[PDB]
Each structure stands twice: as C-alpha cells, then as structure tokens.
Design a protein that fits this description.
about 150 residues, mainly beta, Trefoil (Acidic Fibroblast Growth Factor, subunit A), 6-stranded antiparallel sheet, 3-stranded antiparallel sheet, 13 strands, about 50% strand, binds 4-[(5-bromopyridin-2-yl)amino]-4-oxobutanoic acid, pyrogen, cytokine, inflammatory response
C-alpha cells in the first residue's frame, strides 16, 4: 500500500492537534507551537474511485492509530482506533477506516465511506474536537493538505 505523510488544516486555517489519546482538536496555530500538529500517513486504499473521489485511510504517523467511523450511542462518530501494528497499513482497509477524499473548489472534504454524506468536521470555535458531522452550515467540512518530508 502506498502512503504519503501530510498535515491537514480546515478552511478557516485551523491546525489539528492531539486532545488526549483518542481525540483530535482544531485550533489556530503558528510559530513554535506548529510542531504540535498531528502528522498523518494518508494511505491510498481499496474502494470505489473517480477523478475527484479517492478512498484513503488516515493513520497517525508512526502510531498504530487510525481515524475510524463507527456508531456510538446510535450516532455516526469519529474515533481514533488502535490496530495491530504488524498488519497495518494495508491496501484492503476495513470500511470504518475509509474516507472518500473529494476535491471541490481547490479544497478537500473527507466523507465517511461507511456513512454517506457524513464528513470529518471542525467547529468555528477554537480548541474543540474534530468530529463526524452530517451537515455541509456553521461547521467546517473543507480542508487543505500540506505535504511533509
Ligand atoms: O494548505 C495550505 O494552505 C497550503 C497547501 C495547499 O495549497 N494545499 C492544498 C491545495 C489544494 C487542495 Br485540493 C488541497 N491542499
Ligand atoms: O489532492 C489534491 O488534488 C490536492 C492536493 C494539493 O493540491 N496539495 C498541495 C499541497 C501543497 C501545496 Br504548496 C500545493 N498543493
């Protein structure tokens, strides 16, 4: 499986950082604190694809953790899920790990492959969790990607 290392920023230009072991949060970041931003390994996985819709998994660089979409208290929910490090990343990632990376107007949306029309989202307010949202409103669902060495 092929992977690229990257960071993500939402379209309000908030960076993503760890909020405890199994949550991300989004905040405006610049300067020295830049290094606290999460580096992803974006893997290009099996699934239905088009010019503008590319299935990916989002693992945390050199951690056995992946963003995962599951029902929690009966709602689609974003979580950070641990995996066996000897078996990941792999080309046939389980559906809960797969996001359709969609380019629209020079930005990126990450739709859950498991839960159609639910998206990786951030709040307008600073220091709030990254979450799975079913509305494209006040919540932000557009991102840019930055390549890292
Ligand atoms: O993220 C930034 O503001 C700079 C890097 C950048 O241009 N990233 C980018 C551009 C177009 C798309 Br689509 C996704 N990511
Ligand atoms: O996946 C895509 O089509 C967009 C990716 C993209 O344009 N990324 C990017 C990253 C850094 C810089 Br600088 C410019 N563009």
């Amino acid at each position: 499986v092929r992977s690229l290392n990257c960071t993500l920023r939402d379209s309000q230009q908030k960076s993503l950082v760890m909020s405890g072991p199994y949550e991300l949060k989004a905040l405006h970041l610049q300067g020295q604190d830049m290094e606290q931003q999460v580096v992803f390994s974006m893997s290009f996985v099996q699934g239905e694809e088009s010019n503008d819709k590319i299935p990916v998994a989002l693992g945390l660089k050199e951690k056995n953790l992946y963003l995962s979409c599951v029902l929690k208290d009966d709602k689609p929910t974003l979580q950070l899920e641990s995996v066996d490090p000897k078996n990941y990343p792999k080309k046939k990632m389980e559906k809960r790990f797969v996001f359709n990376k969609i380019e629209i107007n020079n930005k990126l949306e990450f739709e859950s492959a498991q839960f159609p029309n639910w998206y990786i989202s951030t709040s307008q307010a600073e220091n709030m969790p990254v979450f799975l949202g079913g509305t494209k409103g006040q919540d932000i669902t557009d991102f840019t990607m930055q390549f890292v060495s």
